Ligand SMILES: [Cl-]
Ligand SMILES: [Cl-]
Ligand SMILES: [Cl-]
Ligand SMILES: [Cl-]
Ligand SMILES: [Cl-]
């Protein structure tokens with residue numbers, strides 16, 4: 001089932017997502033080959049989560065689905081900003097697929113907030129195409145394994161990258177990476193499932209120490225050009241240099257990316273099957289890196305909300321597992337409630353019901369509900385993922401490594 | 404005046420040109436600021452040449468044209484390939500504009516072979532936007548001036564970049580750059596106009612020596628990732644890493660770019676107001692670098708042609724100054740012919756008429772005409788630019804630096 005269509009190599013595909021609030025398009029940027037396939041070898045035609053976008057690989061000769069993955073993107077978030085009503089922008093996006101033996105047809109799809117198709121691209125990949133850029137053979141970024149439970153075929157490979165660390169600050173980076181690892185494996189279900197993971201710390205160098213602070217006019221030369229003030233949101237620390245992120249990892253087996261930023265300023269970002277980015281020297285580093293990994297690895301939604309008032313239409317059940325609009329609550333955590341739990345669960349009864357249907361979630365105070373009064377996905381001070389987030393993360397771990 | 408709308412800074416705009424043979428689009432990639440404006444300060448609302456694409460900057464408050472430039476692109480050439488009928492691709496393109504004091508509206512337009520609009524983007528640039536990336540203040544690439552005739556405001560600044568040269572091969576690079584300079588200023592009108600130019604050699608390092616050869620499976624880590632087999636044409640050496648090219652030059656004043664590739668293999672190209680790329684160690688380096696600069700700086704067309712058979716429709720007068728379809732020959736070099744010069748000029752009379760209307764030009768043996776039997780824009784063996792190419796180049800030099 002894996003050996004019938006694939007070789008133990010990776011087909012890396014770089015795309016450009018372009019558009020504005022009115023129309024979106026996808027175009028191919030570049031095809032590359034990586035030396036090993038670090039992804040799954042089972043459930044090849046199934047998705048663990050829908051994502052905001054999907055990739056389907058089909059065998060050209062038979063037309064059969066041979067691989068599928070899903071994700072979210074910085075582009076799809078940008079579409080929800082005021083700037084997307086005024087200008088057309090382009091964004092880099094990279095996806096890792098198993099390398100096919102015979103020609104394969106790749107189809108990439110983007111969906112809107114109504115979970116409808118908003119952009120699509122279908123293209124044929126010929127495995128002997130001379131313009132498939134061979135990567136990860138030489139000048140592999142210095143790295144060290146923090147944790148090695150097994151080979152890349154049996155464990156989940158997580159790569160931790162250095163952002164804003166010069167070559168002389170790498171001992172601080174490796175210490176920071178060890179702290180992220182300790183924070184992650186102190187949370188269930190990661191704690192009990194630690195032997196399912198490989199953690200590699202990748203010493204990707206920056207010319208400058210620290211990160212770009214656009215609001216203060218302090219731009220720096222760094223490995224991935226990360227910056228605060230993403231979408232003019234002060235604490236939103238992201239990078240749109242997705243090709244540079246993946247080029248730094250070429251030759252190192254990886255499935256998931258965590259980026260550590262060498263700064264004391266508060267900030268971070270996390271996007272499903274894209275990457276996590278976080279401050280390493282702010283005191284809230286430990287809950288923040290785990291919260292962002294909840295997004296990037298877990299595909300979890302934010303459970304916090306604001307008082308003031310469109311990202312989750314109330315007529316649509318979200319695909320995210322830890323929030324509901326009560327359209328299709330049976331597909332969520334209804335099976336985890338007691339027979340007498342009130343729906344919605346009044347805030348006055350929070351102590352009576354550790355698991356409930358609490359109004360407020362996915363940035364809205366009304367119409368969106370979360371599974372517990374508090375969670376790692378709602379606040380930094382709360383010590384754990386709620387029971388529903390824990391089940392959702394365990395399902396992801398088991399999808400990639402078995403029951 | 405220049406000072407009425409601009410500051411002594413550059414607004415660098417990075418775009419992505421995307422599409423296929425059927426439809427094309429433009430989207431914004433990033434806005435940057437460079438410390439000085441090295442371009443012109445006169446004829447701000449005029450174009451020296453039409454180009455295959457145009458940029459018009461307007462003051463938002465008055466709607467008045469405050470800056471304009473024109474160009475051609477690798478994307479517009481890719482549109483003519485078989486691949487453009489099968490897939491949608493994206494290309495990086497960078498343009499330097501003077502930095503506005505007040506909000507400005509930028510309009511970028513691409514034209515097809517019928518000289519009609521094929522893609523357009525209109526967007527407002529607010530000079531106080533915090534997300535305008537400040538560049539060229541630190542980590543300025545090591546460089547040396549080969550020629551300094553005056554400051555960046557009075558002279559044409561030409562930058563020569565190193566491709567495929569490691570840090571230990573920079574003495575060879577500077578020798579190669581001196582050879583390119585010597586070849587260029589041994590040709591009229593450059594020779595007599597040498598005091599109108601600044602030439603800077605920029606030692607942009609490469610991890611590997613040489614350039615990528617996709618057909619041989621020899622991929623290299625180089626400054627700008629130049630490679631052979633572009634568009635599956637074996638000897639076509641190009642780079643599409645336009646952001647990396649401009650990032651290497653941030654902080655160094657430049658208007659025109661020449662890239663030298665550390666290889667003996669034959670290859671290169673020149674695209675109007677994009678860049679020249681050529682191999683420094685092939686024996687044809689001297690006439691080739693000058694021929695390509697004829698394209699990238701001069702906007703000149705190729706005067707050579709093939710026997711066998713759409714880039715130049717025969718019912719349209721080309722915008723290039725050294726070829727004609729005799730649709731509007733009066734706008735070309737008619738004023739340089741003697742009253743008795745036969746039109747077309749028979750090949751038997753080539754010695755009698757140094758300037759004529761010789762059939763064969765712009766890749767076609769029929770319907771397109773060139774100004775002399777031979778020229779630097781037709782062959783490598785011919786020693787000089789024809790008198791019409793010389794006048795066209797002189798008009799470009801005078802447009803940017805005065806009569
Ligand atoms: Cl069958
Ligand atoms: Cl929408
Ligand atoms: Cl390794
Ligand atoms: Cl800091
Ligand atoms: Cl239900």
Ligand SMILES: [Cl-]
Nearest residue numbers: 613666667668
């Ligand atoms: Cl060579």
Ligand code: NA
Nearest residue numbers: 038152155157
């Ligand atoms: Na793995």
Ligand code: NA
Nearest residue numbers: 441555558560
């Ligand atoms: Na200048």
Ligand SMILES: [Zn+2]
Nearest residue numbers: 291292295302
């Ligand atoms: Zn969050």
Ligand SMILES: [Zn+2]
Nearest residue numbers: 375377386389
């Ligand atoms: Zn939760």
Ligand SMILES: [Zn+2]
Nearest residue numbers: 694695698705
């Ligand atoms: Zn040419």
Ligand SMILES: [Zn+2]
Nearest residue numbers: 778780789792
């Ligand atoms: Zn000529």
